[PDB]
Structures are given as structure tokens and as C-alpha cells.
């Protein structure tokens with residue numbers, strides 16, 4: 001679909017058999033989700049945003065469906081202010097900026 | 100034009116008679132630019148993201164040209180690690196997300 005930016009581009013995602021709302025974030029290299037339980041192994045990592053760095057758990061090769069489009073990639077889980085879908089997954093669903 | 104998200108969507112902007120590289124960021128509510136000496140009055144503000152909040156100066160009705168598309172609106176200035184074009188100006192240049 002075509003999404004205008006008058007409001008936050010929030011969309012429903014499905015990860016680990018659970019529905020959630022997430023922000024399509026072209027300014028994020030990576031996908032960061034709020035605290036949740038995900039199966040499989042994970043590795044501790046650090047990510048930095050506008051206000052500093054936070055500790056996150058990195059989950060690789062995770063299936064996640066964004067607005068009816070499937071993707072399999074890395075998902076970081078930690079104390080982010082909001083679920084954000086970053087470019088690592090936006091590319092998988094064929095998302096582009098157009099003006 | 101169309102911009103893919105394989106790499107950061109950086110573009111050239113023109114503000115206060117200066118050319119800069121800025122990020123087209125659908126996840127950013129409002130434009131925030133790296134520290135620069137803009138004239139005129141301003142109002143303090145704090146914006147939050149990954150890692151916490153930063154203090155910025157809010158300038159109103161600032162003219163910015165993004166990829167030859169003129170815009171005018173709020174521009175925040177503060178210790179951001181990167182110039183960010185937010186939704187408040189992306190709408191003005193007709194920018195949409197598409198997949």
C-alpha cells in the first residue's frame with residue numbers, strides 16, 4: 001500500500017505468534033521491539049539511538065509478518081520507547097520512499 | 100524519485116544558506132538537525148528515543164529545501180548524532196511509504 005506521513009506510520013505485525021503494533025522507521029538500521037519472550041537462542045548486544053545506548057537481546061532469523069508481508073531477519077529486543085521496524089526488514093518487504 | 104532502503108536514505112538539504120546531508124526518517128515526528136547557529140527566537144524542548152532524551156531548540160517556520168522540494172515548518176536543533184528530516188516536513192514534500 002501507499003502510506004502518507006500525516007500520522008505515525010503504525011502497522012500491525014505478527015511475531016512469535018503474537019500481534020503487535022510497530023512503527024515503520026526508515027531512520028532505523030535495525031528492528032527493535034519492546035520487551036517480550038521469543039524462543040531460540042539470543043545474544044546480548046548494544047544499540048545507540050538519539051539519546052544514548054541500550055542493552056538488547058539479538059534474535060536472528062526470526063519470522064515476522066509486517067502488514068501482511070513476511071520477513072525473516074534479525075530482531076533486537078530491549079527497552080525501546082516503541083516497536084520500530086528498521087531497514088533490515090523494510091527492504092525484505094520491498095518498502096521504498098517515494099516523493 | 101524513489102529511494103530504496105538498502106542504505107540509509109541520506110539526501111542533501113538546504114537550510115539557513117547551508118547545504119547538509121540529512122536522513123529521511125519516517126520514524127521521526129519532527130525534524131532535528133545537528134547543532135547549528137540559527138538566528139531568531141526559539142523554545143526549549145526534549146525529544147525521546149532509544150537511549151533516552153536530548154534537549155533541543157525548537158525553531159518555527161524555518162525554510163528547508165529537500166531534494167529541490169521546498170518546505171517550511173518546525174526545525175529542532177540540538178546534539179543529535181545525525182541530521183534527521185521528520186514527518187513534519189516529509190509530508191510537505193509529498194513523501195510516502197510504499198510496499
Ligand SMILES: CC[C@H](C)CN(C[C@@H](O)[C@H](Cc1ccccc1)NC(=O)O[C@H]1CO[C@H]2OCC[C@H]21)S(=O)(=O)c1ccc(N)cc1
Nearest residue numbers: 027028029030048049050124126127128129146147148149
Ligand atoms: C521513537 C521512534 C524513533 C526511535 C525515534 N527516532 C527516529 C529513529 O529513526 C532513529 C533516528 C536515528 C538514527 C541514527 C542515530 C540516532 C537516531 N533511529 C534509531 O534509533 O535507530 C536505532 C535502531 O537502528 C539503528 O540505526 C539507527 C540507530 C539505531 S529519534 O532519533 O530518537 C527522534 C525522536 C523525535 C524527533 N522529533 C526526531 C528524531
